[PDB]
Design a protein around this nucleic acid. Structure first.
Ligand SMILES: C[C@@H]1C[C@@H]([C@H](O)CC2CC(=O)NC(=O)C2)C(=O)[C@@H](C)C1
Ligand SMILES: [Mg+2]
Ligand SMILES: [Mg+2]
Ligand SMILES: [Mg+2]
Ligand SMILES: [Mg+2]
Ligand SMILES: [Mg+2]
Ligand SMILES: [Mg+2]
Ligand SMILES: [Mg+2]
Ligand SMILES: [Mg+2]
Ligand SMILES: [Mg+2]
Ligand SMILES: [Mg+2]
Ligand SMILES: [Mg+2]
Ligand SMILES: [Mg+2]
Ligand SMILES: [Mg+2]
Ligand SMILES: [Mg+2]
Ligand SMILES: [Mg+2]
Ligand SMILES: [Mg+2]
Ligand SMILES: [Mg+2]
Ligand SMILES: [Mg+2]
Ligand SMILES: [Mg+2]
Ligand SMILES: [Mg+2]
Ligand SMILES: [Mg+2]
Ligand SMILES: [Mg+2]
Ligand SMILES: [Mg+2]
Ligand SMILES: [Mg+2]
Ligand SMILES: [Mg+2]
Ligand SMILES: [Mg+2]
Ligand SMILES: [Mg+2]
Ligand SMILES: [Mg+2]
Ligand SMILES: [Mg+2]
Ligand SMILES: [Mg+2]
Ligand SMILES: [Mg+2]
Ligand SMILES: [Mg+2]
Ligand SMILES: [Mg+2]
Ligand SMILES: [Mg+2]
Ligand SMILES: [Mg+2]
Ligand SMILES: [Mg+2]
Ligand SMILES: [Mg+2]
Ligand SMILES: [Mg+2]
Ligand SMILES: [Mg+2]
Ligand SMILES: [Mg+2]
Ligand SMILES: [Mg+2]
Ligand SMILES: [Mg+2]
Ligand SMILES: [Mg+2]
Ligand SMILES: [Mg+2]
Ligand SMILES: [Mg+2]
Ligand SMILES: [Mg+2]
Ligand SMILES: [Mg+2]
Ligand SMILES: [Mg+2]
Ligand SMILES: [Mg+2]
Ligand SMILES: [Mg+2]
Ligand SMILES: [Mg+2]
Ligand SMILES: [Mg+2]
Ligand SMILES: [Mg+2]
Ligand SMILES: [Mg+2]
Ligand SMILES: [Mg+2]
Ligand SMILES: [Mg+2]
Ligand SMILES: [Mg+2]
Ligand SMILES: [Mg+2]
Ligand SMILES: [Mg+2]
Ligand SMILES: [Mg+2]
Ligand SMILES: [Mg+2]
Ligand SMILES: [Mg+2]
Ligand SMILES: [Mg+2]
Ligand SMILES: [Mg+2]
Ligand SMILES: [Mg+2]
Ligand SMILES: [Mg+2]
Ligand SMILES: [Mg+2]
Ligand SMILES: [Mg+2]
Ligand SMILES: [Mg+2]
Ligand SMILES: [Mg+2]
Ligand SMILES: [Mg+2]
Ligand SMILES: [Mg+2]
Ligand SMILES: [Mg+2]
Ligand SMILES: [Mg+2]
Ligand SMILES: [Mg+2]
Ligand SMILES: [Mg+2]
Ligand SMILES: [Mg+2]
Ligand SMILES: [Mg+2]
Ligand SMILES: [Mg+2]
Ligand SMILES: [Mg+2]
Ligand SMILES: [Mg+2]
Ligand SMILES: [Mg+2]
Ligand SMILES: [Mg+2]
Ligand SMILES: [Mg+2]
Ligand SMILES: [Mg+2]
Ligand SMILES: [Mg+2]
Ligand SMILES: [Mg+2]
Ligand SMILES: [Mg+2]
Ligand SMILES: [Mg+2]
Ligand SMILES: [Mg+2]
Ligand SMILES: [Mg+2]
Ligand SMILES: [Mg+2]
Ligand SMILES: [Mg+2]
Ligand SMILES: [Mg+2]
Ligand SMILES: [Mg+2]
Ligand SMILES: [Mg+2]
Ligand SMILES: [Mg+2]
Ligand SMILES: [Mg+2]
Ligand SMILES: [Mg+2]
Ligand SMILES: [Mg+2]
Ligand SMILES: [Mg+2]
Ligand SMILES: [Mg+2]
Ligand SMILES: [Mg+2]
Ligand SMILES: [Mg+2]
Ligand SMILES: [Mg+2]
Ligand SMILES: [Mg+2]
Lengths: 51, 99, 105, 49
RNA sequence: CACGGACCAAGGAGUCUAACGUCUAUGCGAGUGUUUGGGUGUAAAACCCAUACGCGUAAUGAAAGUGAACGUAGGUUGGGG
RNA sequence: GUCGAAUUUGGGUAUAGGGGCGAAAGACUAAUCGAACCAUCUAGUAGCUGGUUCCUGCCGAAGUUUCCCUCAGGAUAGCAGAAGCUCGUAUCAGUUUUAUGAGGUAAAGCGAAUGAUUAGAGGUUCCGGGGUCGAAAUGACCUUGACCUAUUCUCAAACUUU
RNA sequence: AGAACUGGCGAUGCGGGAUGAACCGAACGUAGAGUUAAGGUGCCGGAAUACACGCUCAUCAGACACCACAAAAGGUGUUAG
RNA sequence: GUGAUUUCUGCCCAGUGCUCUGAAUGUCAAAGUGAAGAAAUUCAACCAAGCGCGGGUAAACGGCGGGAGUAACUAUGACU
RNA sequence: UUGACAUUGUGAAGAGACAUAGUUUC
RNA sequence: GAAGACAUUGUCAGGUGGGGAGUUUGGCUGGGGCGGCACAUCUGUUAAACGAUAACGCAGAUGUCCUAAGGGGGGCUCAUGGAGAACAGAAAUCUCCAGUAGAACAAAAGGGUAAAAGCCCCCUUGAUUUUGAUUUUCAGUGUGAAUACAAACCAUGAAAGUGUGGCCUAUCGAUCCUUUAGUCCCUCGGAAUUUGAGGCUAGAGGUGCCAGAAAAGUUACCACAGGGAUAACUGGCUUGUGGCAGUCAAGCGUUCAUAGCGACAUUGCUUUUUGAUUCUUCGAUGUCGGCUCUUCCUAUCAUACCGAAGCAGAAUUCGGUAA
């Protein structure tokens, strides 16, 4: 018979993540010279909902 | 599909054999053509003959070794004995066979 | 059935060529051997793809097998097959039938 | 319907075979409790000792 | 009270080919088959031809192999002429 | 039916055929869906259905045998035609007669064998059971059984002398 | 529904059985004359409303093989024993 | 998988599946090893996963008996 | 999925043989 | 930075793999299916006195069993019964008489058999070797089984003889391939030796759908070629079954066969029962019931006129002419 639903998922056609409104990926700072020998300061400038 | 006292036949026509029928309608034509070629070669080839001297040779196998037959060319030996090198013999309408 | 372990019968062996005593035994088999041309052709036929390439018998109906005696001339060495009717029970050991005895206990 | 799924079809709704499917199953086969090492209502306290 | 067929024209179905059995006609005959080819031509014709080859003249064995007259190529009985 | 939302809806865009898509009906995928459409392989195969085109002359069937994944089909034999060929009073015959065999059906039989079946009569017990006399009896007397003798009515595809 | 022997129908018209595959008669070139078969001869309809002895009267008579149905049982109807 | 709430959700791991820190001298491929042979080859040992053995698991698939008696009328049967 | 061979090299300790020198193998 | 000769990848090998592919999923048959086997056979009968002969006809049987239950020779006579003998009885073992087989011979049945073909004993391997001919089934193929000889070698018996499995009529198997026995024979094609392999002759391993494929289901989502050679519905033959009506008259009915009834038997009719058949229709003749509406039949429920009664009256029952 037919290809079942959970196999069709993988070709991600109608099944890809809805992404348009997202803030961007969440990530720590790239591990540079500051963060691994000292510290570096930032300001949280906005806390915000991410669809 | 088996009947009567008939001999058993083997007619191999199970492939698309009609795609591979050669009927020589061009017998007469090719003959003419073939003859014209010869008249042409003769004329081009000035006074030379249309063919080369070929050697006697005894034919192979128990069946034909009774008979003797035109060979290919003349063996480096035979030429030498006949008082000439092979490079020349070739230009004089004589076939030579190194093997 | 129970048949004798020996038997005096005809021996066809040029020198023997008479009735001589034979030792009776029961034919078996013979290991297969690849390198028989049959096994050789079969083995090739089954390589690559295509699956079983020869038939395989299933519709078994017999429940017996004709027994075959090996008869060996103690003089002239040579052997002679002879084949029995279908039977279910074959021994060629002994225990001959007895006269007219009572049933035991 | 059967075309669509291992679970499809039958004149009553039902799985017709254990829905705990092997790890080594193949695409098209893995529906239900994959690789399930137990099954049934969990009784008693969980929490990794 | 089974099926096709309202009507009319025109089209519309055992063919050709490879290899064969029986029969028959014809050529030649222990032979036979010119047409792969060559020669030649009034040019796909008609005419001519060397070497091979095919079938036949030998059979029988798995094979190695062997291989057809005792005799008026036999005796007996019927045989047309 | 529902009508402010799992709402309706345009354009753009993605997913393509053993594939998609499916709030799941085997639904939908351009009047096509339990596998779309186009061309080609392809004049696919068909033990099955239909049709198969002028005239007259002569001869003229089978539906049976055997084998077959055989039972709407084949092969085999038979029946049929054609061609003739070797001969010719000759040899021939879906017939009779005569002589000599075989047969167990129809009839018949059952006071003949096997097997069935109605009725009595006469026998026979140290011995099948009852009952009277009994201390019993291998005692006597009735009794009913079977068995026996000579009879009697009736039967047979798998009975029979004839 | 299934066998035996023969004869048929199928493959076959013709005369008869009104009608009808298989019954009766008889098998087929185109025709003239004659005679018949099976079956008929009141009229339809070719052919004696012929001859002869009986029997039969039915307010649901009867009427020709295959064949298109009738039984037990009854009658002081009538007939002959 | 089941199908709001409420309430409840029992017994069965022998079978079929799933699964495991399990055991081990049973089975078990190719290569590799040994032995015989002039070699082709033959034989043997070792031997992965798997299987077999052992354990878990039903909101996995699913399952959740039959006969005989027994109370001061009968009936019934808590009881055997 | 599991094994073998190839990609595949370098030290060290411990086993494994000509049968208690180091070439070899785990 | 992590990782490290491990992963990875490449090639073979084992496991797993309806996720997917391709395929298959007997026949006869009073439709098909379930069943049975009439599918390969045997006896008796059907079978119509040669032979042949059908049905899912009748009563049975076969896929085995036997080192003797095969082969030869001698001796003996069986089933049964009567009359006899301590314990001993219906039945133990002894003897005599009668005894045509009333027994026994693996088995189904039928044939056969008495100094045997049965029972007891003695000696045995002819249940062997070679390759042809013949009878049944038949195509005058095969297979099975069997018959009579030829050529060996044996057995038994004093011998003539007899013996080529089982007294006769059933008890079984192609081609390919494997395996074994045979002769020490042929071939491996450049020549040899040796392994190996290949031939020739005869056996075994089996096809029971038994002249001999290698084979699970489901479809109501369904498809095609056909079939009236074939079921489901009308209609046709039949009429067991269903329904209806008689004849005889033993009984019922206080008495009394027949007012009204009517056993045991027995003759029929009907075709709104159900079966049985399978002739018509499967390139289609629209199912069940109801509604509507016509007409017809009579085996008459009512209504008209009657006859009978176990008809006093009233009521009822039986019968006739009547649709
Ligand atoms: C069952 C087994 C095999 C069978 C036979 O080899 C089956 C073969 C037959 C044939 O000719 N060709 C095939 O493809 C199959 C046979 O003879 C038996 C005795 C033993
Ligand atoms: Mg994306
Ligand atoms: Mg060709
Ligand atoms: Mg082809
Ligand atoms: Mg061309
Ligand atoms: Mg030249
Ligand atoms: Mg030897
Ligand atoms: Mg599925
Ligand atoms: Mg599954
Ligand atoms: Mg289901
Ligand atoms: Mg469910
Ligand atoms: Mg038609
Ligand atoms: Mg029409
Ligand atoms: Mg025209
Ligand atoms: Mg000219
Ligand atoms: Mg030209
Ligand atoms: Mg010339
Ligand atoms: Mg020449
Ligand atoms: Mg030749
Ligand atoms: Mg030769
Ligand atoms: Mg020689
Ligand atoms: Mg003579
Ligand atoms: Mg798919
Ligand atoms: Mg496809
Ligand atoms: Mg694809
Ligand atoms: Mg559905
Ligand atoms: Mg369209
Ligand atoms: Mg559409
Ligand atoms: Mg065509
Ligand atoms: Mg077409
Ligand atoms: Mg057919
Ligand atoms: Mg004629
Ligand atoms: Mg077959
Ligand atoms: Mg037939
Ligand atoms: Mg037809
Ligand atoms: Mg008889
Ligand atoms: Mg008789
Ligand atoms: Mg009689
Ligand atoms: Mg008589
Ligand atoms: Mg009698
Ligand atoms: Mg007649
Ligand atoms: Mg016809
Ligand atoms: Mg006629
Ligand atoms: Mg007429
Ligand atoms: Mg009439
Ligand atoms: Mg009129
Ligand atoms: Mg008139
Ligand atoms: Mg007159
Ligand atoms: Mg009459
Ligand atoms: Mg009268
Ligand atoms: Mg669940
Ligand atoms: Mg729901
Ligand atoms: Mg949910
Ligand atoms: Mg509870
Ligand atoms: Mg408990
Ligand atoms: Mg369990
Ligand atoms: Mg190994
Ligand atoms: Mg269970
Ligand atoms: Mg590894
Ligand atoms: Mg690596
Ligand atoms: Mg699979
Ligand atoms: Mg499949
Ligand atoms: Mg069938
Ligand atoms: Mg069938
Ligand atoms: Mg049936
Ligand atoms: Mg059946
Ligand atoms: Mg039959
Ligand atoms: Mg058959
Ligand atoms: Mg048989
Ligand atoms: Mg037989
Ligand atoms: Mg006869
Ligand atoms: Mg016959
Ligand atoms: Mg007998
Ligand atoms: Mg005697
Ligand atoms: Mg034997
Ligand atoms: Mg044959
Ligand atoms: Mg024969
Ligand atoms: Mg005997
Ligand atoms: Mg040998
Ligand atoms: Mg050699
Ligand atoms: Mg050679
Ligand atoms: Mg060579
Ligand atoms: Mg040698
Ligand atoms: Mg050798
Ligand atoms: Mg068959
Ligand atoms: Mg057969
Ligand atoms: Mg099959
Ligand atoms: Mg299928
Ligand atoms: Mg009736
Ligand atoms: Mg009736
Ligand atoms: Mg009745
Ligand atoms: Mg009476
Ligand atoms: Mg009275
Ligand atoms: Mg009275
Ligand atoms: Mg009725
Ligand atoms: Mg019909
Ligand atoms: Mg009908
Ligand atoms: Mg129809
Ligand atoms: Mg129609
Ligand atoms: Mg219509
Ligand atoms: Mg109509
Ligand atoms: Mg009336
Ligand atoms: Mg009146
Ligand atoms: Mg009175
Ligand atoms: Mg009226
Ligand atoms: Mg009227
Ligand atoms: Mg009227």
């Amino acid at each position: 018979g037919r290809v079942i639903r959970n196999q069709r998922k993988g070709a991600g056609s109608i099944f890809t993540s809805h992404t348009r409104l997202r803030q961007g990926a969440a990530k720590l700072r790239t591990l540079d010279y500051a963060e691994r020998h000292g510290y570096i300061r930032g300001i949280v400038k906005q806390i915000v909902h991410d669809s | 599909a088996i009947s009567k006292n008939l001999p058993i036949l083997k007619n191999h026509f199970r492939k698309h054999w009609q795609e591979r029928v050669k009927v020589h309608f061009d017998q007469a034509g090719k003959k003419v053509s073939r003859r014209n070629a010869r008249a042409t070669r003769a004329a081009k080839i000035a006074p030379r003959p249309l063919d080369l001297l070929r050697p006697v040779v005894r034919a192979p196998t128990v069946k034909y070794n009774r008979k003797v037959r035109a060979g290919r060319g003349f063996t480096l030996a035979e030429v030498k004995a006949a008082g000439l090198t092979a490079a020349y013999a070739r230009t004089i309408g004589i076939a030579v066979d190194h093997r | 059935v129970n048949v004798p372990k020996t038997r005096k019968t005809y021996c066809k062996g040029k020198t023997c060529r008479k009735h001589t005593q034979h030792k009776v035994t029961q034919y078996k088999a013979g290991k297969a051997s690849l390198f028989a041309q049959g096994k050789r052709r079969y083995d090739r036929k089954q390589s690559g793809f295509g699956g079983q390439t020869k038939p395989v018998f299933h519709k078994k109906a017999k429940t017996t097998k004709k027994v075959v005696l090996r008869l060996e001339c103690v003089k002239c060495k040579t052997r002679a097959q002879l084949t029995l009717k279908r039977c279910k029970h074959f021994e060629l050991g002994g225990e001959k039938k007895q006269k007219g005895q009572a049933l035991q206990f | 319907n059967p075309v669509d799924h291992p679970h499809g079809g039958g004149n009553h709704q039902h799985i017709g075979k254990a829905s705990t499917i092997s790890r080594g199953a193949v695409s098209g086969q893995k529906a239900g409790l994959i690789a399930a090492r137990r099954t049934g209502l969990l009784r008693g306290s969980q929490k990794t000792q």
